[PDB]
Design a protein around this ligand. Structure first.
Ligand SMILES: Nc1ncnc2c1nc(Br)n2[C@@H]1O[C@H](CO)[C@@H](O)[C@H]1O
Ligand SMILES: [Mg+2]
Length: 390
């Protein structure tokens, strides 16, 4: 009669990490990739013999900086002249070229110089997320919901759809990331009456606050605010500068000119930063860091909190601006939702809870997974084709 339909997937196509989910048996499954990771780096690397995507691309970035592409989402749907693009190019080791006032990334790949549009790089990340899902389901996947930031314009939204089409996906809908995080908590299923929801999204490189109103399951974006120069990488930089100084005091040596030693220090700092979200202290143990000297040290959560104190407090400025723009008082916010791995930081949670007079934060869905979770919930709703009973 009618063959069973394949499940549709929800993709969070992130600037630094991407995540894929599927709603089945009344629940969302966030799908781990073949290395057991529930999030996949939005990285694509090019060599003489291969194109690597995700963890394989991110793991070889140190020795292949010119041909490993990341941050394509900062270029998608933008003009080459755009001041955002020009400033961002100074921080990237890969080449960004001008093709008819449209940016393209230029690399060495399989013996040739090749240039790609940002939507083509994003399509490679989407092909990997589709394959992660088909490895779990055991059949080909066709349908997907893809999320974007609420501030994305029409051109940025159309380029995202174009990336989906290149990847062989049927894009059911492009939905806003804060709307997807709200859907994950079922905040559109609470019945009649208006609800004001604040989404607090602290990423690897940027911070976004959104205020949404939800009335009978209808979403309206009331205000957006944030900080483009505030994210997880800034907290990693503070630990790096702290340990460089510490090595100087202890061994009278400046390591800051050996890229390998700095990179090994930063990698260790990022992991110590993650440990400090669950423990009150963390160890840093690097062998032969510089001039055959082993660096075996520690850092308390209190010292880390002091090192990043100004950065953590600055997350409250866009919160107050968003509340002024939405014309709301903090007491009028019904729900607070956390998005991004950096929101696991206990001090970040405490500052925000204190700002909203002890209110509970929705953090039960892994903050790095909430956007894909809501996108998977929406994807299952969009493919329903029920015919009314008499
Ligand atoms: N448990 C965690 N505690 C503190 N930070 C974290 C955690 N998990 C993740 Br993931 N991060 C950071 O989130 C950002 C995502 O792009 C990166 O800067 C990660 O280091
Ligand atoms: Mg995100």
């Amino acid at each position: 009669g009618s063959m069973a339909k394949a499940a549709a997937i929800g993709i969070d196509l992130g600037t630094t990490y991407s995540c894929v989910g599927v709603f089945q048996h009344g629940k969302v499954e966030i799908i781990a990739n073949d290395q057991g990771n529930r999030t996949t780096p939005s990285y694509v690397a090019f060599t003489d013999t291969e194109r690597l995507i995700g963890d394989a691309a991110k793991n070889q970035v140190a020795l292949n900086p010119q041909n490993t592409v990341f941050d394509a989402k900062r270029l998608i749907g933008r003009k080459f002249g755009d001041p955002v693009v020009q400033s961002d190019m100074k921080h990237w080791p890969f080449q960004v070229i001008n093709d008819g006032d449209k940016p393209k990334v230029q690399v060495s790949y399989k013996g040739e110089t090749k240039a790609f549009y940002p939507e083509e790089i994003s399509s490679m990340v989407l092909t990997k997320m589709k394959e992660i899902a088909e490895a779990y389901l055991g059949y080909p996947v066709t349908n997907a919901v893809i999320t974007v930031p609420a501030y994305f314009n029409d051109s940025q939204r159309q380029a995202t759809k174009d990336a989906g089409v290149i990847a062989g996906l049927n894009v059911l809908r492009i939905i806003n990331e804060p709307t997807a995080a709200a859907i994950a908590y079922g905040l559109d299923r609470t019945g009649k009456g208006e609800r004001n929801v604040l989404i607090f999204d602290l990423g690897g490189g940027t911070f976004d606050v959104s205020i949404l109103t939800i009335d009978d399951g209808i979403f309206e974006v009331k205000a957006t605010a944030g900080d483009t120069h505030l994210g997880g990488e800034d907290f990693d930089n503070r630990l790096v500068n702290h340990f460089v100084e510490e090595f100087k005091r202890k061994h009278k040596k400046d390591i800051s000119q050996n890229k390998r030693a700095v990179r090994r220090l930063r990698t260790a700092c990022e992991r110590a930063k993650r440990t400090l979200s669950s423990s009150t202290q963390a160890s840093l143990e690097i062998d032969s860091l510089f001039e055959g000297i082993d660096f075996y040290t520690s850092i308390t959560r209190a010292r880390f909190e002091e090192l990043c104190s100004d950065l953590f407090r600055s997350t409250l400025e866009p919160v107050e601006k968003a509340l002024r723009d939405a014309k709301l008082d903090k007491a009028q916010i019904h729900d607070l939702v956390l998005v991004g791995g950096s929101t696991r930081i206990p001090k970040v949670q405490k500052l925000l809870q204190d700002f909203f007079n002890g209110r509970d934060l929705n953090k039960s869905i892994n903050p790095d997974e909430a956007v894909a979770y809501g996108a998977a919930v929406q994807a299952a709703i969009l493919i329903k084709s029920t015919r009314a009973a008499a």
